[PDB]
């Protein structure tokens, strides 16, 4: 049918470690492009640096702008609907900010608009090496991982830049450099407006967040969490998808760094942007993109259906 048939093409934009297809085999947006296309949507999947800042000449933002232009040329369209996961949402904001005439909407899924306490943590861990050699060694490993897994073996990988970009202090600077009507006041845990208009260009702004990881007990200055996406302990998702327990682990570090409810690496407050459709999904960070390989806990909503319904929402909104 045409349930997901939007006026403007939808460009799905990946975040950290990403590419359109890992090693040219595993779709980042698992089963999403096919689902949307089957429902009549025109969908393109960006392939940007998995590790980089969003701004800068070598950044993901310029890469996405360049890609948007090739999509407009190929389809004959004048604007696109940007849907970004995690850092992809920040990249989408960059394009909406520098080329408002080419964007009709920006939807962010689990995007760290205010940064990540987990990025703050990882950056701090690196600082404890007195020699600084681990920064060089680990960055090299990660950069190589990015080049090897990129579908096109993109050599533009800068793990340290990516890490810095996702920290809370740097995200605050990014927000000053690239403001948006969809963002509320820093430190307020509020969203902004549902739209932004610059000159004759209006952008429909949306967002949702996964809050599977909930702080549930505090003892001796230590906060314990619960992964609400799963049936306690026995959920097959803990067995079939290694990221389920991994994100519960990172999510625990998050709550102990004062993040509050989160998806494993992005807090609810950090994810707020534009019209906040929901922050109640019992999803971890990868459940948001139907990963790994479609496995999610028993209490987790269907992410394929959520994204599809949103394509229809965009259609109904006129974009
Ligand atoms: Ca999962």
Curated annotation (Swiss-Prot):
Task: Quote the InterPro entries the UniProt record gives.
Answer: AB_hydrolase_1, AB_hydrolase_fold
Annotated disulfide bonds: 189-269
- Locate the AB hydrolase-1 domain: which residues? 9-221
Kindly list the biological process annotations in GO that this record carries.
Answer: lipid catabolic process
Sorted UniProt keywords: Calcium, Disulfide bond, Hydrolase, Lipid degradation, Lipid metabolism, Metal-binding, Secreted, Signal
Superkingdom: Bacteria
Q: What is its EC number?
A: 3.1.1.3
Q: Which reaction does it catalyse?
A: a triacylglycerol + H2O = a diacylglycerol + a fatty acid + H(+)
Q: How is the cofactor bound?
A: Binds 1 Ca(2+) ion per subunit.
Q: Where is the active site?
A: 86, 263, 285
Name its co-factor(s).
Answer: Ca(2+)
Subcellular location(s): the record lists:
Secreted
- One Gene Ontology term, aspect cellular component: extracellular region
Q: Where does Ca(2+) bind?
A: 241, 287, 291, 295
Q: How is its activity regulated?
A: Inhibited by RC-(Rp,Sp)- and SC-(Rp,Sp)-1,2-dioctylcarbamoylglycero-3-O-p-nitrophenyl octylphosphonate. Also inhibited by diethyl-p-nitrophenylphosphate (E600).
Instruction: Extract one GO molecular function annotation from the record.
Output: metal ion binding
Q: Where does substrate bind?
A: 16, 87
Similarity section: Belongs to the AB hydrolase superfamily. Pseudomonas lipase family.
Protein task:
Catalyzes the hydrolysis of triacylglycerol. It shows a preference for triacylglycerols with a chain length between 6 and 12 carbons.
Subunit description: Monomer.
Name of this chain's protein: Triacylglycerol lipase
UniProt organism field: Burkholderia cepacia (Pseudomonas cepacia)
Question: Upper taxonomic classification of the species?
Answer: Bacteria, Pseudomonadati, Pseudomonadota, Betaproteobacteria, Burkholderiales
